[PDB]
Amino acid sequence: TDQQVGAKLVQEIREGKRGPLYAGYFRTWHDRASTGIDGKQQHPENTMAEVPKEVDILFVFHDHTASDSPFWSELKDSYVHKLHQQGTALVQTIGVNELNGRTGLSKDYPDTPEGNKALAAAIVKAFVTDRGVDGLDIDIEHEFTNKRTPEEDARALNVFKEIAQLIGKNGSDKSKLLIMDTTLSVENNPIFKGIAEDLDYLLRQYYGSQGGEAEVDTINSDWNQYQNYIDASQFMIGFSFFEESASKGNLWFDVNEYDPNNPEKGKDIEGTRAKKYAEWQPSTGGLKAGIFSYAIDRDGVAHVPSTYKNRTSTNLQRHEVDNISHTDYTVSRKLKTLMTEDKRYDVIDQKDIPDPALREQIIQQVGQYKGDLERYNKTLVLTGDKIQNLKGLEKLSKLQKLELRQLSNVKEITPELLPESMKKDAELVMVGMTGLEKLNLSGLNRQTLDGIDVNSITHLTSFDISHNSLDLSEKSEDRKLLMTLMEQVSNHQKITVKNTAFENQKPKGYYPQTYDTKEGHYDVDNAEHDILTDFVFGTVTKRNTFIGDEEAFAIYKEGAVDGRQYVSKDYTYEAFRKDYKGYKVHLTASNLGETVTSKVTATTDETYLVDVSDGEKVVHHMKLNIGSGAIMMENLAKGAKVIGTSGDFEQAKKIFDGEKSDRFFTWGQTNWIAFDLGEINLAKEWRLFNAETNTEIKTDSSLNVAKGRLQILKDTTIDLEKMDIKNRKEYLSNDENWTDVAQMDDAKAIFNSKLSNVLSRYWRFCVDGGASSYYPQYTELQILGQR
Ligand SMILES: CC(=O)N[C@@H]1[C@@H](O)[C@H](O[C@@H]2O[C@H](CO[C@H]3O[C@H](CO)[C@@H](O)[C@H](O)[C@@H]3O[C@@H]3O[C@H](CO)[C@@H](O[C@@H]4O[C@H](CO)[C@H](O)[C@H](O)[C@H]4O)[C@H](O)[C@H]3NC(C)=O)[C@@H](O)[C@H](O[C@H]3O[C@H](CO)[C@@H](O)[C@H](O)[C@@H]3O[C@@H]3O[C@H](CO)[C@@H](O[C@@H]4O[C@H](CO)[C@H](O)[C@H](O)[C@H]4O)[C@H](O)[C@H]3NC(C)=O)[C@@H]2O)[C@@H](CO)O[C@H]1O
Numbered sequence: 001t002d003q004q005v006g007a008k009l010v011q012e013i014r015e016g017k018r019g020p021l022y023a024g025y026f027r028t029w030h031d032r033a034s035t036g037i038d039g040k041q042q043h044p045e046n047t048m049a050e051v052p053k054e055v056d057i058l059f060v061f062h063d064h065t066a067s068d069s070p071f072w073s074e075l076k077d078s079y080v081h082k083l084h085q086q087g088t089a090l091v092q093t094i095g096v097n098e099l100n101g102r103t104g105l106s107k108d109y110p111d112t113p114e115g116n117k118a119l120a121a122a123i124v125k126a127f128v129t130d131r132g133v134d135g136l137d138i139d140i141e142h143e144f145t146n147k148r149t150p151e152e153d154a155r156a157l158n159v160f161k162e163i164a165q166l167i168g169k170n171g172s173d174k175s176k177l178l179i180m181d182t183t184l185s186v187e188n189n190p191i192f193k194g195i196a197e198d199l200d201y202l203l204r205q206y207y208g209s210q211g212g213e214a215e216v217d218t219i220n221s222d223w224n225q226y227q228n229y230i231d232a233s234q235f236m237i238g239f240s241f242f243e244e245s246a247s248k249g250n251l252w253f254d255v256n257e258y259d260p261n262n263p264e265k266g267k268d269i270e271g272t273r274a275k276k277y278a279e280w281q282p283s284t285g286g287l288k289a290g291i292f293s294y295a296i297d298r299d300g301v302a303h304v305p306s307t308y309k310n311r312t313s314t315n316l317q318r319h320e321v322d323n324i325s326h327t328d329y330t331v332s333r334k335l336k337t338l339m340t341e342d343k344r345y346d347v348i349d350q351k352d353i354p355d356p357a358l359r360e361q362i363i364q365q366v367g368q369y370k371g372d373l374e375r376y377n378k379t380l381v382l383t384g385d386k387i388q389n390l391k392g393l394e395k396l397s398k399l400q401k402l403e404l405r406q407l408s409n410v411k412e413i414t415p416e417l418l419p420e421s422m423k424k425d426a427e428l429v430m431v432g433m434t435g436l437e438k439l440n441l442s443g444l445n446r447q448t449l450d451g452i453d454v455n456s457i458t459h460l461t462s463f464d465i466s467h468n469s470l471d472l473s474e475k476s477e478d479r480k481l482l483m484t485l486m487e488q489v490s491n492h493q494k495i496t497v498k499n500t501a502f503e504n505q506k507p508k509g510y511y512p513q514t515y516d517t518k519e520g521h522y523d524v525d526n527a528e529h530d531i532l533t534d535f536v537f538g539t540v541t542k543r544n545t546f547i548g549d550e551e552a553f554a555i556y557k558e559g560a561v562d563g564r565q566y567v568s569k570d571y572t573y574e575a576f577r578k579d580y581k582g583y584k585v586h587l588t589a590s591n592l593g594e595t596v597t598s599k600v601t602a603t604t605d606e607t608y609l610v611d612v613s614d615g616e617k618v619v620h621h622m623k624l625n626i627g628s629g630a631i632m633m634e635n636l637a638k639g640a641k642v643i644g645t646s647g648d649f650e651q652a653k654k655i656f657d658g659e660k661s662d663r664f665f666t667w668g669q670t671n672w673i674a675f676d677l678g679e680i681n682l683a684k685e686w687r688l689f690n691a692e693t694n695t696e697i698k699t700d701s702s703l704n705v706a707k708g709r710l711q712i713l714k715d716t717t718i719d720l721e722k723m724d725i726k727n728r729k730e731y732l733s734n735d736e737n738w739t740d741v742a743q744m745d746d747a748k749a750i751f752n753s754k755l756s757n758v759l760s761r762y763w764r765f766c767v768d769g770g771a772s773s774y775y776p777q778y779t780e781l782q783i784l785g786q787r
C-alpha cells in the first residue's frame with residue numbers, strides 16, 4: 001500500500017536511519033504539470049518525478065499554481081508513488097499566515113479553543129490528507145511590512161500545537177512529519193519556543209553570507225540558543241540556488257558564478273557557500289541533521305555575475321542564466337555524497353569505546369556518530385555492574401555532568417579517562433562505587449569533593465586528589481571526606497604519601513555571602529575611617545571558610561593533615577583574595593541626605609544607614625553610629641495635601657510623592673505651593689530637589705530654581721476650610737500671611753538647610769526666580785523632623 005510505504009519512510013527518517021539528510025524545496029510552478037489561473041502551462045522543462053534518490057525529503061513549495069491545476073492530482077496519484085519507491089518523502093509547505101487569521105482557512109474559524117482545534121484539523125485535511133503527502137512544514141519568516149501582532153503569533157502557536165496533536169511525533173498519526181522552517185533567531189521566535197518539542201526538524205534558512213571571516217557567524221551564534229530547544233540531529237541549515245530574474249534582495253551567491261569560458265561552472269561545488277554549509281557542524285550538542293536547498297529545480301544553473309547584483313524589477317539587467325533549462329540535479333547529488341562520506345558520521349565503534357556496556361549507554365545518550373562525541377555538552381548517566389572499563393569517556397570533552405551510579409565493576413578512575421571539562425568544573429557524581437581500587441583526580445582543579453560517595457568506596461587502595469583547588473581546612477566538609485578516603489586506604493595498606501596524595505591545593509577565593517556587623521560604631525576622634533576596610537572585607541573558600549586579611553591567609557597556608565601541609569607553598573594571598581573593585585558605599589545620614597563614599601570623618605555625633613553595593617546588587621546593610629549617634633529624621637512632608645498653588649493642582653501633588661520623576665513649573669519665573677502636613681510635629685531641616693534631579697527627562701541645570709522661600713502660616717488661629725475656594729486661594733497667595741523659615745539663594749541640584757525647630761501645620765514654598773530665562777522647575781520637597 002502507498003500509505004504504508006510512506007509511513008515506513010517517515011519512521012526511518014524520524015529514527016535517524018539515513019545519516020546526513022539532504023532536502024530540497026521544489027517550486028510548484030516549475031513542474032510541467034503546473035497551470036496558472038488562465039489554465040496555461042507555466043514551465044515544461046522540469047518535473048518533481050525526476051528528483052533523485054539523494055534527496056531524502058522534497059518540500060512542495062506552492063505558488064502561482066492555480067487550484068484547479070492538473071499538478072495537484074498529478075502529485076497525488078503519480079509523483080508521491082514514484083518518489084516513495086526510491087525512498088523520498090513529500091512534505092507540504094504552508095506559511096504561518098494560514099494559522100494566524102490572515103489567510104486561507106484561518107479566516108473562516110474563530111480564535112477560540114474549539115475554533116483553533118477545528119482549524120487545525122482543516123489544515124491537516126486540506127494540506128496533508130487531500131494532497132497525498134507525508135507531512136507539513138510551517139514557514140515562519142520575518143514580516144518586514146506589517147508585523148504580526150502578539151495576538152496573531154499567540155494564535156499561530158495554539159493552532160500549531162493542535163496540529164502537532166494530530167500529526168507528528170506526538171500526534172495521533174505518527175506516519176506524518178511535522179517541520180518548521182524559519183529565518184528568525186530564538187529571541188525573535190516565540191512560536192519556535194512553544195512548538196519546538198513537537199518538531200521533527202527545524203529548517204533554518206541561511207541564504208547568502210552570515211558574517212565573519214568564514215561567513216557563518218550568525219549560524220554559530222544562533223545554534224548556541226536553538227540548542228536549548230532541539231537536538232543537533234534536528235537542525236537543518238539551508239542555502240538557495242540561483243532563481244531566474246532574481247533582483248537585489250534575492251541574490252545570495254550561494255553557488256558559483258557564470259563563466260563564459262566554462263558552461264558547467266554552475267555544477268561545480270568547489271568554493272561555494274553550499275559546500276561550506278555541507279561541511280559546517282555545530283560546536284556543541286551534536287552533528288547537524290543535514291542541509292537543504294531552496295529552488296531545487298534550478299540546481300546547476302550558474303549564478304548571475306556579481307556585476308548584475310544591483311538589478312531591480314524597474315531596472316532589469318537580463319543575463320543568459322535567467323533562461324529556464326532542464327536540470328539533472330548534479331549539485332544536489334554531489335552535496336549528499338560529500339555529507340554521507342564525511343567520516344564524522346561513522347558510527348561510534350569498539351575502537352572508540354571498547355567496553356560494550358559503556359558503548360551502549362553512550363550511544364543511547366549522546367548520539368550514534370563519532371562526531372557527536374566531542375560536541376555533546378549535557379549529562380551522561382552510567383549505571384550497572386556490566387561496565388568494566390571507562391576507556392573512551394575522555395572523548396566526551398565537553399560533557400557538563402558525569403554521573404556514575406552503582407558501577408560495581410569499575411576499578412580505576414584517572415584524569416586520562418575523564419573529559420577535559422573536568423578541569424573546568426564539570427559536575428562529577430559517583431555513587432555505589434564498591435569495586436573502585438584507584439581514584440586519581442589529580443590536576444583537575446576540583447573545588448569540592450561533593451557528590452563523591454566516599455562511604456561506598458570500600459575497596460580503595462590508593463587515591464590522589466593533589467593539585468586541585470580544595471579547602472581541606474579544619475572545618476571544611478572536604479576534610480571530612482578526605483578522612484574517610486584515608487581510612488579506606490588504611491584498611492588495605494599502610495598509608496603513604498603516594499597512595500593518599502592530597503597536597504598542593506589552591507583554593508579559590510569568593511565574596512563572603514554575608515557580613516557580621518549589623519551595627520558599627522566610631523568615636524568622635526576627628527579622623528577619617530573606611531567602611532569597607534572596617535566592616536565589609538575579606539574572602540571565603542567554596543566551603544565558606546573566612547580569611548580576613550593576609551595574616552589570616554598565612555595561618556591558612558600552614559594547615560596540615562597528619563603533619564602534611566596541603567596548601568601549595570607558592571600560592572599567594574594576591575591570587576586568593578577578592579579585590580572588591582567597583583564596590584560602592586551608599587550613606588544615608590540622620591538628615592536623610594545621601595552620599596556615595598566609603599570614607600567617613602568622625603567629627604560629630606551622627607548616624608548613617610549604610611548600603612554596600614558591588615556594582616549590581618546590595619551585598620550588605622548595616623547602621624553606623626558616630627559618638628552617641630543621632631535619631632533618624634522622617635520626611636514629614638511625605639504625601640502632604642496640596643491646599644493651594646499658583647500652578648496646576650495635580651502637578652503640585654507630585655512634589656510630595658517619593659520620586660524625582662516629575663517636575664513642577666508654571667508659565668513664568670515665580671510660583672508657590674501651599675501644603676498641609678496634616679498633623680503638627682517638629683521640623684528641623686528641609687530639602688529641595690531641583691530641576692536637574694529629574695529622573696524621567698534629562699534636565700539641564702539652567703532650568704533650576706535659583707531663589708526661593710519656605711514659609712509657615714503666620715496665624716495659627718484660622719480655619720482654612722471655613723473660607724470659600726476663591727477667598728482661600730487669595731489668602732494663600734498673600735505674602736503677609738506667611739512667615740519665612742528658610743531662604744534659598746543658590747541653584748544647587750539639591751538644597752538643604754536647617755529650621756529653628758519650626759512647629760507648623762501649614763506651609764508654603766515659593767519659587768522667586770530661576771537660574772536662567774527658562775521657567776524654573778523642581779521635582780520634590782522634603783520637610784524633615786520628628787514624630
Ligand atoms: C521557505 C522559503 O524559502 N521562503 C522564502 C521564499 O518564499 C522566497 O522565494 C520566493 O517565493 C515567492 C512566493 O512566496 C510565497 O511564500 C512566502 C513564504 O511563505 C510568502 O511570504 C509569499 O507571500 C508566497 O506565499 C504564497 O501566497 C499565495 C497567495 O497568498 C498562496 O496562494 C494561495 O494558496 C491558498 C491555499 O492553497 C489558496 O489556494 C489561495 O487561493 C492562493 O492565493 C500560496 O499558498 C503561498 N505559498 C506559500 C508556500 O506559503 C515566489 O513568488 C518567488 O518567486 C518569484 O520570483 C523569482 C525571482 O525572484 C522567480 O524566479 C519565480 O519564478 C517567481 O516569479 C514569479 O513567477 C510567476 C509565474 O510566471 C509570475 O506570475 C506571472 O507573472 C507575469 C509577469 O509579467 C504576469 O504578472 C502574470 O499575470 C503572472 O501570472 C510572477 O510575476 C513572478 N514574480 C516575480 C517577482 O518574478 C520566490 O521563489 C525566498 C526568496 O529568495 O525567501 C524565502 O525566505
Ligand SMILES: [Ca+2]
Nearest residue numbers: 654655659779
Ligand atoms: Ca516628586
